Structure formats: C-alpha cells, structure tokens
Amino acid sequence: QRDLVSFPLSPAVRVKLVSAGFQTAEELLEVKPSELSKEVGISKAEALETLQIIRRECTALELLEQEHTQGFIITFCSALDDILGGGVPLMKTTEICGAPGVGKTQLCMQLAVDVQIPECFGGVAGEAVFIDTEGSFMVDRVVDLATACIQHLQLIAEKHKGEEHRKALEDFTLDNILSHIYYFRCRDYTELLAQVYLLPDFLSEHSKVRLVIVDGIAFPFRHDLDDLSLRTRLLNGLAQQMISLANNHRLAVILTNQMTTKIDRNQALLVPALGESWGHAATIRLIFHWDRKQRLATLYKSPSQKECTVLFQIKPQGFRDT
C-alpha cells in the first residue's frame, strides 16, 4: 500500500482524488481510465500523466572496486595529496575558503590543467568545466600552468624512458589541453542557477568531462539579497543539485568560498561566510590562511581522513610544494 502523497502529482488532482475517495496507489491500477476520469472530473491528458508518473515510481564491494578503479586528481602538492588520500576524490563535493590573495583561483586553474593528465602517469584524462562569477579567469596564467605541466611530464617521461609514455605525451600538447576547457560566465545568481539547470544535458553530450569548477559562490549571493530564508532555500537546493549531479555523472566538484569576521567580546575570528547550515553541504572542506610569510592548508571537515596542516607555495610554475 503506497499513499498518493508519496507521489509527485498535482495538488489539484490529489484534492479531487481524496474528494472522490482515493487513498492508495494500488487501487488505481485496477480501474479503467475512462471510469475514474468521469467519476473525478479529470480530463484524459492529466489522467494519462498521473498514470505514467505513478508507473515510474550495488553492494559495498562494487563501491570499493569503483573507488579503486578511478583515481584522484593530483594537485602537484605531495603533502596535500597525502592528506587528501591521493588528491581530490571523485563523486564528492569539495569546498575551499580563504582570505583574498591566498591562491584559491590558482588552485582552480591548476586542477583544470591537471584533470587532463593522461592515465599513464596516474591522471584521469578528462575534460573540465569552468564557471566564472567574478571575471578572474586569465588565459595567460592557464597557458603558463599548462606549459609548466608540459615540461614536468616531459622530463619525467624522458627520465623514466618508457615507450607508451611518449605516445601518451604525443597528443598532450598546448592546443589540445587548451581546447578541453569549457568556459561559462555568470553575473547574477539567476544566471548561475540557469547554467546549473543546463549542466546535466551538456554533461550528457560531453561524457568525457571529469571536472566541474565554480569559482566564486559567495559573491552572487551576498549582495542585494535581503531575504535570508530565500537565500537559505536557494543554497540548499543548489547543494542538493550539485551533489546529485556529481554522483550521477562521476564528477569531481570544487566550490570556492570567502571568509568573514565573527566578533565575540573584544576578539575577532575569521570564519567561512554564508551562515552555519552551509557547513553541512560540502563533503570536504579546506581552509587556506596566512602565518607570517607562509601559506597553510588545513583539512577542516572530512569523513575519510584526519585533520592535518600542509605548507604550500605559489610559484611561476604554479601550485607547488614547500
């Protein structure tokens, strides 16, 4: 016995059905549509729609095999990969927070470049989708990062002196890697929601995409939005849609956040913005902050590893160690 409330039917048709004495989905399957339609005063089209929507409504070993057969996305940071278990995990939503100038955008560019590394070197060999909300995407920086990756991979392959490594690196050229990054631009949050809604079919046609980046999510939602409840509902819906998409399409998702100041008594602490309930949305959360002239990466929340602190650096080659 399945209640009608458990189905995504129209409120009007459900009101009519409960008026006519309908409370179970099982009894609906044994009645001709004409008789029920003339009894409840419902036209043929919506009756057929109700009939079809009613009709339409993986052991852990397989999960282990799937997790092991697909790798992580390397960040060119050995310690960060070690504390992440191998890099950014697929099927998981990741969040990055930090004060301006720490290097969130550099990390996003590095990930977009690295996601196309051939699997012979431990990569995923997939495309990337970059969504920009603040206009901080500079092509020259991406070119520099791609050239640095080219040089590093070429040196590693030459030192190892294999055979299939050279073949894999043959097609791994600047034009090929630059042609596999898809760029979108959103100004208002309505445009971001529209692009999110269009994402499923686009990923369906572009089945080789293995990365989705949304650089800047606090900016579209922190200005000219007085109603806090509406913002909370929109953010919850966006998080649910993003995790559903990431799991369905075998994707790694990275979101970028901004810090804010919380004042208690007479001392101030830097905390991530967008309220407290937003903390449950991200599967993995990282925080970048300054200490003297050193940059530190802290794993704040994660259901697989332990809290750690990592020293990283930004160089002309890009995101690196030390």
Added chain:
Amino acid sequence: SSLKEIEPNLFADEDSPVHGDILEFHGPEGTGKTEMLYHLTARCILPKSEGGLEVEVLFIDTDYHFDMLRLVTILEHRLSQSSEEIIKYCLGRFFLVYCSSSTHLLLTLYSLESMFCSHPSLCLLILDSLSAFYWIDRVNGGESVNLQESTLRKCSQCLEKLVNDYRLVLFATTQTIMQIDYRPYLCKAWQQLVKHRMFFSKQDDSQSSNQFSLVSRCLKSNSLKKHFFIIGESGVEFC
C-alpha cells in the same frame, strides 16, 4: 466507578459515579504524558490486594511509542512481591490496538464494538495522539475546510457515541505545534467534547529534571489546579 478513588490528587472535587468523562493531555516533547499514562495503567491493572482495581483497560497506539519493557519494569518495581506468574496474570488483561490512518482508525473504532459489547467489564479507554494525522488530512483536502477534518469529525462522533453509550472514562493525548498558552487547531466538536485540560510543562534545570508542573481547569468553573510530581524508575510519585 467514582472519580475520588481514580485520582484524588489531580481531581480535587469531582467525585461521583461517572457516566462518562473525556480527558486530554497537551504538552511539548519529553514532558511525561506517556509516563503518566503508564502510571495510570499500573494503578488500574494490578490486583485489588496490591492497591489495584481489577478493571479492564484498552490502549490505542498511534504514535507507535508504546514501550512494553518500560511498562513491565514499572509494574515489577511498583508491587511488593514479584514473580513471573503474577505478572503474566496481570498482563493477561491489557489491550493494545494499532492504527495507520484516519480511515483505518475509524474502521478500528467501528470494529471494536463487537468485543466491546461482548465485554461489559471494559470501563477505561486510552487514546494517544489523535492529532498525529492532522497535517496529512489538512493538506489532502486543500483549501476546502469541510473536505479536511471530515473523517476526524466522524471519528469524534463515533467516540462520543461510544463513551456516552457504555459509560467510559477516556484519556487523550495531543501535540503542541503552533505558537497556560494554548492554540487549538482541531475540530470544534471535539473541542466542545472535552471536560478538563492537562497542560504539561517541564523545568530545564537538572535539579528539577524529575519535577514537572501541571495546570488543570474545569470547563464549568474555570478553576486552576497546580500539581508537582517526581518521576522514577518505579513509576510516578507525587509531592
């Protein structure tokens, strides 16, 4: 069947052989309505020798929150001499019924009448969470007020008929959802059918974690009664 022996503490001066009485409980989560019902059942189910009454009781379970281990622990810790045979003999009288929907509730109400007329010994009835399906049938009926609450009104009519027919005493359990504060949201008829209100409140501090406050009013006198009581593993004890 006099109200003085049932509960002289809560009921100050209402003593008479009852032709029928309706009592309802209102309170937030974790206040002690179920524990009070357990205490009433324990005081109403034991043999006359151990302060019991030896009269029939029926329990309707709608919240699915009835715990039998707690009840048996309360009965064991209440009496003087404890044994398996006597506890089985005592629990051979308890009655429990399950429900799943308002229509199923009405069907069970109608079906119970066979055993109910076959047993003149039935004198006390317990209903819990008659507002459990309030949101479901409020949303099913849409904006039409008559469309909603209709089956609840029929159930109230049947319950009133039964209780005024065979001289029952009934205890009901409600829920606090909206907002001595009280905001009714049920049907008007059942609101009229009540006789006294048991507002349930709980104190935050751990020193009073076992002490709770009760307020009762009489519909024909509007008199306020206050009561403090202490919960325990053996049951419910008063001040």
Added chain:
Amino acid sequence: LRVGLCPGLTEEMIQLLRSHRIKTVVDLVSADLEEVAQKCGLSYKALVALRRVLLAQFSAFPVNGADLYEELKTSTAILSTGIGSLDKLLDAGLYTGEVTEIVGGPGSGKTQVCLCMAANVAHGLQQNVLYVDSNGGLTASRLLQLLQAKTQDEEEQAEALRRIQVVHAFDIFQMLDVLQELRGTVAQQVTGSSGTVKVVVVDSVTAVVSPLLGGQQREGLALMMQLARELKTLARDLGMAVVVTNHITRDRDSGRLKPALGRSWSFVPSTRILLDTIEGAGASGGRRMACLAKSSRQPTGFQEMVDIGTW
C-alpha cells in the same frame, strides 16, 4: 466501491448504492442502514452480513497483553553499537522496533558513528544492513579500515561487506520510493528466513527535507510527516532497527541548542543522542561529548565522554 474484493457482492447492488455516496466503504459502514432497505431496496439479512464481513477484513483486532508479552519475549533483540561508552550510555545497545536519532553539528560524529555501528552489525552479528546515503558522506575506505581494525581475514571482510547495501536518494521522492520498495519486498519475503535486513540507516534526513521547508507552503511539512510515518511503521510493524541523523540549530530568542526540522519533527523519534565537540583543552581528535536528550527508559540530561578516533 470495488468489485471482486469480497464474496456476495453483485454487479447490480454496486450501482444501486450510488444514491448515498461513492467515496469509500465508510459510506457502507458509517451510515444508518435501516433506511437503505427502502431508499434503494435491499435485503436486511444480506446487508448486515456484508457490512460485518467487510468490517472484518478492513480493520484490526486487539491483541491481549499476555500474548504480546510472550511474543516479544522471543522476537525483540538488542544490538550493540560497538562503543563501550555508547553501550553503557544507552544500555548495551539499541533496541529494534524504535527510532533512533543522532543530532550533531557540522562534522562532529554522526557519519562516523553510523559507519562504525554498521560495520559492527555486519561483522559481529552476520546480518544484512541497508544504508541510505543522501549527502554523499560514505566512503568504502572508511568501512574497510574499520573492518581491518576488527579482523584480519580477507574473506571475512569480503563476506561482511557483502551484507551492506547502499542506495542513493537526493530528494524526498527517491527516498520514499526505496523505502516503500523495501517494505514491499520484505512483506512479500516473510516466508523465507535468510537474507533479511534488520538495520537500516539514513545518512541524513535534513538534506532532503530542508529545501521543501521555508515559506508559507504546506506540502513540505506533509511530505516530512509522511516520511516519519513510513519510518515509524517500518520500525514497529516489522521489528527493525532504524537510525537517522539530523542537524542542530541555535535558537534566537533563548540562544539554546535545538534540533532542526521544527516542533512537528520534534515528536518523531524516541531516543535522542546529541554529539558536541569539547572546546578548549582536549579539543579536536576523537575527544567529543555524547549526551542523551530523550529516552523512554532512562532519565534525560545525563553526560558522557566518547571518542571517535579509537576504532
């Protein structure tokens, strides 16, 4: 009305009784049937028999207390959570047939506790367990680590993992669909005695409920109540151990910690566990606070110290 459900129904009487109402059998059972014999024309002796048999097959009959006592003496059970602190906190494991709710802050302990309990039940008792992951918070490497911490045989670990089933549901409708599918398949498979599921864990109910709430709508609250009713009937009418996790909110007027999803959801579970992180000294790591906020067998407000990094 419906045809073929009960014997004695004629194809003429069903359309003859159209005079009063057509909605449900409540018309047949909740009417004054004396006037029906002349309003439409019916035999008195057949009408009462039909009403009696229909009421018989379309209701429930009370069960005596002694029978329920005896049957629970041989049916119910208790399943340890794998943590001595929790076990001594809630009497050496949780009882099947009730609803257990775990409430905590972001990242405190909920998913880890659920995973460790599932690993214990799958290995220490050799029973099937279903996991409903909604927020994506379940990695198989954590389960493998827990199983390695328990035993070392590879085949034992594989067999224990083979009893764990995971389903993804990112909205209320998918969760309702999978739960109803489990209800149907178990109710149909009552004849057998192998492969049954005794514990089902919902990773997060706030993930699929929060978008519906907020505003002046009513459908979200009705859906939440329907999901709660389904979980309660699955736990009680079948004798299963259900564990769900929920978020925690900070009140505005009073500033006290309060479970999410509101007052209507506040009445749903029977046992409440609250997890908090110990600030200042002893922070981070596994060191955390476990408290009992609601129980039907213990006094509330008690305190207990537990760790989530020693298993």
